């Protein structure tokens, strides 16, 4: 069944595979991230609660007082979103916090404090996220882009062959905290362990171990095993572990108990290892040459001298053994330093470093961190204690602790925020283990090692940054506080927090201007995962490792949607089904496979969990019970695709679209497109301009409705019901009694947003798509916005295309467009431009906005009113005066339309500073706006009252119904009625109480609206009044505009061909667009040819329906043909039936299908070629997809039948009238008298360095000389050249460029005397 919005126009679905998981709310990431920032969290884990609990309570350095925390609250925003956009303010809510200040007197640790005081202090505002995932920051709409940064924790890397020029890989380890300093351990070609903090000077690693109060002997005992030499009788019979004997060369004869295990000189074999293990060998005799290279573990002293004889970590020789022989020491501990498995790295590090005691380590660290300062014991101790071991200056977050414990093979995942001795020790031991040969380094690009910072998380970090300053100020103030006089309002400074949050939201690398020219553009800007930003990479630094596609990007990051250019692969886009883990990692759904049956339950797996599993591919054939039909299925085990058994499979892909994003899933036949062309197609689909009328892609993918609805541009019905009233700018829905809450009646009013400016100067305009008295259900579109047709995304228009060369007018990449396309006004777009005229309080007098302007006639000022502001609806062109303004000396400084720009003034807004005596036009605008507000409030009140009286009348039909004399009494006199004793009279009283509340709130809101409209406006400092004029230009089409398709097929229009010159088929229908066949082989986007053929089939179905419909036929034949069309497919799973449409929905559906049958081709489960042939054969169209075409001009038939069809062409936002520029003479820069840059400034083209080389390669010495002297910066030369050109003499005086004089002055401004010596 279909809920009356998918029953008007059913898109034919060629998807074989059945869907399992519904496509989620695509804007879930932004909304869910910001929701756990403002909402109250009792546990205190998320949001502002976490920040407040982390900062508060605030004490002093001494035990004087303490300011603690109670709760926070977000007040109601002062301005609505629309009002916020109109005025130019930020859309924010005041953050009011309850604080209690307690004061501690002499000896009151647990006793009652002197006084307590709780007040709701105000500390700044936080911008609020609109219901579409966007913010309004200064009247513009911005999006905070999610960041894909490097997860906190410990990582191990190699640095394979970039150093030592020998191929010896190093092994470094980095401990990245969420907020703190970096600790890096490293190796060197000499195999010594080194440490560094914040990537400063490389000091030895054991220095930090000593700074942790570890002596040399315990360090060696911690990083090494002990070999025991006991001098029992003689020759130092050594206690031996049989396991330690594998891998070395025996220099002596290993014999014991009359059984020579190893002969002299020979190595140690595995056979002898087994024999030693099974013979229970513990102590063996050793020679004298063996101890000569060993290192003593700990220290020893003599009994005579009583002092040190041999310090720890010193190579034992015959002298040391002889000296300790007489001391009485028989048990000697030595280090086991194997050559290949247990290296002596800590020993060599202890040798190299000059530190011996803890104070020396601390002072060395202090000198490294702070260079040149006089170091002190106390200062060094404090610095090292606050480096990694203080909760203020260092904090591993929960993710940092989890990754730290996982990478060290720990048991628990929850621990302390700060580091400890054991953590650093374990990191060093793990790095040494990696060096020895056990374990492998981590890959930084792995998606199990990269988090997702989002808007809420970054906003709360910035809030913490702001709160830290406020905490410091409060700590400082508590020592100078007049305690029993003030409340915690003057204690808190609301400026730092607000400044920090406004700096983050307004001027940041991730809170960026929203790309709003297309619903797809918005919905893919919100789901953008950027690797740059604060705490991330930079496009001039990262390369070749984060740019490429990683095998863990499957199902989490789109492989084809990434901006080509400066940052490819740094601005990845989130996949369709990808969610964010609890810790911030990207996870993707999978269907569980317990037995051979594929269970219908979904588990979200992240990258590390997915690494050890076998996941069957999405295109795996299954039966009704659910089983892999093949006995060997294609899966991927550990980042590697292969073939696996029918039983081993553990998970399966939920859907075949889960690898691509919402921009790359709108490309029909993506699987036939080359990856580069698909990338271009997605990135250009982002840039389509909303045309006059959307045109419902004939060949879609089925994701159009999801993208159109999930992005907020339509009017989706909140509660189902019956449409009561539909005008162009408002829809009224009477909710069904089943969905109506007990109490308020209870109908929905949707105020459509008519023609308004987007961020890209396009048109946003919602149009109703429902008629009066038409039932709607919950979640149905009521108004389709820009680039939307009946709730389906519709960017471009689908036009009849022919692939053939045409006299070179589609030579390389060009398009050829008929005059029928420009006559039907189907690529005509509306562009709304905002022009501001500001009257600034300047010196020598203020600026007036009067209509009395000199130097102009009355015909020029005839379009203005008496107040000097153009009328609404005037067709002003380039050069017309929009807003008359003069500035004192008087001179004309009026706001005029820029040259070349036409259009109609559609809306004029006047902003006046308080107390400036607004003129007549501002008064007219404000009185008409107040009347409009009163009209809107009265209309909503009377609509609600009509609904309320309807509900009362419906209630009054049972239990004492009165229908004859009910209208005799006035409808307002319904409080003194007659009724029995039941809850119905209580419901009537509830309705009356809600009506009284409506009346009171209506009066209050009318007064509030009058106050908010008549009041002054908070303008910039120095401006008197601002007048904003909104022109509505209409750009039709012209040679030069760049049109494209969905498969990376670009092309600028080269000619607007006459209707009778285009090629036509046998029926006389001309093709709308001619394309070049030669672009298909080289750029392997075969998907456009298949889209052409399938669109031809769809339009053939539509033409058949149109023929059967225009000459009236019975509904039986019509429904028979529609059912045959919808039942055409190999193993499709749509299965729509027409026996349940009741002969009035079949007619509506056929009316909607008479312009072609919409067809859904899933992104990788799409229509096969054979099905396209069958659908073409269903109409009267050839199977091959090519028809003979006749030349328009000559009339002769083109041989080699050409490929004709219907391609869904888009009009990108690269228009030639916005690209064309020219300049003869204009303004010139100040420092260098060279022409300005750009075209917004009337600037000149840059004849750059390579152009100078190109002229030098010719013999053009005079052309170059006039290029870089007369035409650029020779002031006298250029004035003389202009005078000579006007005089008709083309000759230049060379002169000398002014920029050379500037360079001479700048070099002379150093201590360098540079001059031009005399001739």
């Amino acid at each position: 069944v279909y809920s009356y919005t998918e029953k008007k126009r059913i898109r034919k679905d060629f998807g074989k595979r059945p869907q399992v998981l519904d496509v989620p709310y695509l804007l879930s990431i932004q909304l869910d991230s910001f929701q756990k920032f403002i909402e109250q969290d009792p546990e205190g884990q998320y949001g502002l609660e976490a920040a407040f609990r982390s900062v508060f309570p605030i004490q002093s350095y001494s035990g004087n007082s303490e300011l603690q925390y109670v709760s926070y609250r977000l007040g109601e925003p002062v301005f609505d979103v629309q009002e916020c956009q109109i005025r130019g303010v930020t859309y924010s809510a005041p953050l009011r916090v309850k604080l209690r200040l307690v004061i501690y007197e002499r000896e009151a640790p647990e006793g009652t404090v002197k006084d307590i005081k709780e007040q709701e202090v105000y500390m700044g505002e936080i911008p609020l996220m609109t219901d579409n995932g966007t913010f309004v920051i200064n009247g513009t709409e911005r999006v905070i882009v999610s960041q894909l940064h490097r997860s906190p924790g410990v990582f191990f890397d190699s640095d394979k062959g970039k150093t030592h020029s020998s191929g010896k890989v190093l092994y470094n380890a980095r401990i990245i905290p969420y907020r703190g300093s970096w600790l890096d351990f490293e190796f060197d070609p000499k195999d010594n362990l080194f440490v560094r903090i914040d990537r400063r000077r490389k000091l030895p690693a054991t220095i930090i171990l000593r700074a942790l109060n570890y002596t040399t002997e315990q360090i060696l005992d911690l990083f090494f095993e002990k070999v025991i030499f006991e001098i029992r009788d003689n020759k130092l019979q050594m206690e031996l572990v049989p396991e330690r004997l594998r891998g070395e060369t025996a220099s002596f004869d290993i014999e014991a108990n009359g059984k020579v295990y190893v002969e002299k000189g020979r190595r140690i074999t595995a056979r002898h290892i087994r024999q030693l293990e099974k013979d229970d060998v513990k102590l063996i005799e050793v020679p004298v040459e063996y101890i000569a290279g060993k290192v003593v573990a700990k220290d020893y002293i003599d009994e005579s001298t009583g002092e040190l004889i041999c310090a720890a970590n010193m190579e034992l020789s015959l002298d040391l053994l002889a000296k300790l022989s007489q001391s009485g020491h028989k048990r000697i501990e030595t280090l086991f330093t194997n050559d290949l498995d247990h290296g002596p790295y800590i020993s060599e590090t202890l040798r190299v470093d000059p530190t011996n005691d803890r104070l020396s380590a601390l002072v060395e660290i202090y000198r490294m961190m702070r260079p040149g300062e006089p170091p002190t014991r106390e200062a060094a101790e404090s610095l090292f204690e606050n480096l990694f071991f203080s909760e203020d200056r260092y904090d591993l977050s929960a993710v940092g602790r989890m990754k730290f414990n996982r990478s060290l093979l720990r048991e628990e995942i929850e621990g302390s925020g700060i580091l400890s001795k054991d953590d650093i020790i374990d990191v060093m031991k793990k790095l040494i283990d990696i060096r020895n040969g056990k374990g492998e380094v981590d890959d930084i690009d792995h998606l199990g090692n990269r988090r997702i910072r989002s808007v809420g998380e970054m906003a709360e970090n910035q809030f913490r940054v702001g709160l830290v300053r406020v905490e410091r100020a409060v700590k400082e103030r508590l020592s100078l506080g007049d305690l029993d006089t003030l409340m915690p309002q003057d204690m808190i400074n609301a400026k730092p927090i607000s400044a920090a949050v406004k700096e983050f939201f307004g001027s940041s690398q991730l809170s960026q201007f929203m790309d709003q020219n297309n619903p797809l553009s918005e919905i893919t800007h919100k789901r953008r995962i950027s690797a740059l930003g604060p705490g991330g990479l930079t496009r001039e630094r990262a390369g070749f490792e984060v740019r490429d596609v990683h095998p863990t990007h499957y199902g989490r990051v789109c492989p084809i949607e990434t901006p080509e250019g400066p940052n490819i692969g740094l601005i990845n886009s989130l996949s369709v089904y990808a969610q964010t883990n609890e810790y911030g990692f990207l996870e993707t759904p999978y269907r569980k496979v317990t037995d051979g049956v594929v269970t219908d339950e979904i588990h979200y797996l992240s990258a590390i969990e997915e690494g050890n599993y076998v996941i069957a591919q999405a295109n795996s054939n299954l039966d009704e019970e659910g089983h892999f039909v093949e006995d060997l299925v294609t899966c991927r085990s550990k980042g590697e695709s292969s073939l696996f058994s029918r039983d081993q499979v553990d998970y399966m892909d939920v859907s075949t679209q889960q690898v691509v994003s919402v921009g790359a899933s709108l490309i029909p036949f993506l699987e036939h497109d080359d990856a580069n062309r698909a990338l271009m197609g997605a990135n250009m689909q982002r840039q389509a301009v909303p045309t006059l009328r959307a045109d419902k892609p004939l060949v879609g993918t089925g994701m159009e409705r999801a993208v159109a609805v999930d992005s907020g541009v339509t009017a989706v019905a909140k509660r189902g019901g019956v449409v009561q009233y539909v005008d162009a700018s408002r829809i009224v829905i009477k909710v069904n009694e089943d969905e109506m809450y007990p109490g308020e009646a209870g109908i929905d009013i949707y105020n459509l947003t008519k023609y308004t400016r987007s961020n890209q100067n396009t048109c946003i305009n919602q149009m109703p798509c429902v008629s009066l008295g038409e039932p709607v259900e919950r979640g149905d579109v009521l108004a389709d916005g820009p680039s939307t047709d009946l709730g389906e995304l519709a960017l471009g228009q689908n036009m009849r295309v022919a692939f053939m060369p045409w006299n070179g007018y589609n030579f390389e990449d060009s398009i050829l467009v008929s005059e029928r396309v420009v006559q039907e006004d189907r690529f005509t777009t509306i562009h709304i431009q905002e022009l501001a005229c500001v009257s600034r309080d300047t010196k020598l007098g203020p600026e007036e906005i009067t209509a009395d302007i000199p130097n102009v006639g009355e015909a020029a000022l005839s379009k203005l009113d008496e107040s000097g502001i153009v009328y609404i609806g005037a067709e002003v062109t380039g050069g017309d005066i929009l807003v008359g303004k003069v500035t004192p000396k008087v001179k004309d400084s009026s706001l005029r339309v820029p040259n070349g720009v036409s259009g109609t003034v559609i809306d004029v807004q006047v902003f006046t500073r308080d107390g400036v005596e607004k003129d007549k036009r501002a008064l007219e605008i404000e009185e008409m706006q107040l009347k409009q507000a009163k009209k809107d409030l009265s209309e909503e009140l009377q609509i609600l009252e009509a609904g309320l009286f309807s509900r009362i009348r419906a209630v009054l039909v049972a239990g004492g119904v009165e229908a004859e004399k009910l209208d005799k009494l006035p409808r307002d006199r319904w409080l003194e009625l007659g009724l029995t004793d039941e809850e119905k009279q209580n419901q009537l009283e509830q309705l009356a109480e809600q009506y009284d509340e409506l009346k009171h709130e209506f009066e209050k809101k009318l007064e509030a609206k009058r106050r908010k409209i008549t009041q002054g406006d908070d303008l910039a400092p120095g401006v008197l009044k601002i007048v904003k004029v909104y022109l509505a230009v209409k750009r039709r089409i012209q040679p030069g505009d760049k049109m494209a398709g969905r498969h990376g097929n670009k092309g600028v229009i080269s000619k607007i061909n006459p209707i009778e010159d285009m090629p036509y088929d046998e029926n006389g229908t001309p093709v709308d667009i001619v394309l070049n066949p030669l672009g298909v082989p080289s750029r392997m986007n075969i998907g456009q040819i298949l889209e052409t053929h399938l669109g031809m089939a769809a339009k053939g179905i539509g033409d058949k329906i149109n023929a059967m419909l225009k000459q009236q036929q019975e509904v039986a034949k019509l429904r028979e043909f529609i059912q045959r069309a919808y039942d055409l497919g190999a193993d499709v799973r749509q299965k729509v039936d027409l026996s349940t449409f009741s002969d009035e929905e079949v007619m509506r559906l056929a009316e909607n299908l008479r312009k072609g049958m919409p067809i859904a081709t899933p992104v990788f489960d799409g229509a096969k070629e054979a099905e396209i042939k069958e659908l073409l054969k269903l109409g009267d169209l050839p199977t091959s997809g090519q028809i003979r075409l006749y030349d328009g001009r000559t009339g002769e038939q083109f041989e080699r039948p050409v490929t004709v069809g219907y391609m869904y062409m888009l009009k990108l936002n690269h228009l030639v009238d916005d690209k064309m520029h020219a300049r003869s003479t204009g303004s010139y820069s100040l420092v260098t008298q060279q022409p300005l840059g750009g075209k917004a400034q009337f600037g000149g083209q840059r004849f750059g360095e390579m152009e100078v080389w190109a002229l030098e390669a010719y013999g053009a010495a005079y052309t170059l000389q006039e290029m870089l002297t007369v035409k650029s910066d020779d002031v006298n030369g250029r004035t003389k050249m202009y005078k000579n050109i006007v005089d008709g003499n083309h000759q230049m005086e060379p002169g000398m460029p002014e920029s050379f004089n500037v360079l001479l002055k700048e070099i002379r401004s150093l201590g360098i005397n540079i001059e031009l010596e005399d001739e």
Binding site: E1256, Q1265, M1296, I1307
Partner: protein, 66 residues
């Protein structure tokens, strides 16, 4: 090499307009170097005829009539 040969040029303006402006200018200032601007980049920077194409005749004329 091309960069070492283009920095070790008797005319210091070409080397200054190439990489390492600071070092080249420091060397030229300390050594008191004098530039005859007899190349193509120097005359571009100064803003006169390039001694290559139609400007070769002019440069020859100014050498003959020095």
């Amino acid at each position: 090499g091309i960069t070492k040969a283009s920095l070790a040029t008797e005319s210091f303006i070409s080397a200054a307009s190439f990489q390492e402006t600071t070092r080249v200018l420091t060397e030229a200032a300390v050594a008191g170097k004098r530039d005859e601007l007899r190349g193509l980049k120097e005359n571009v920077i100064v803003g006169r005829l390039i001694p290559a194409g139609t400007g070769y005749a002019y440069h020859q004329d100014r050498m003959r009539r020095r």
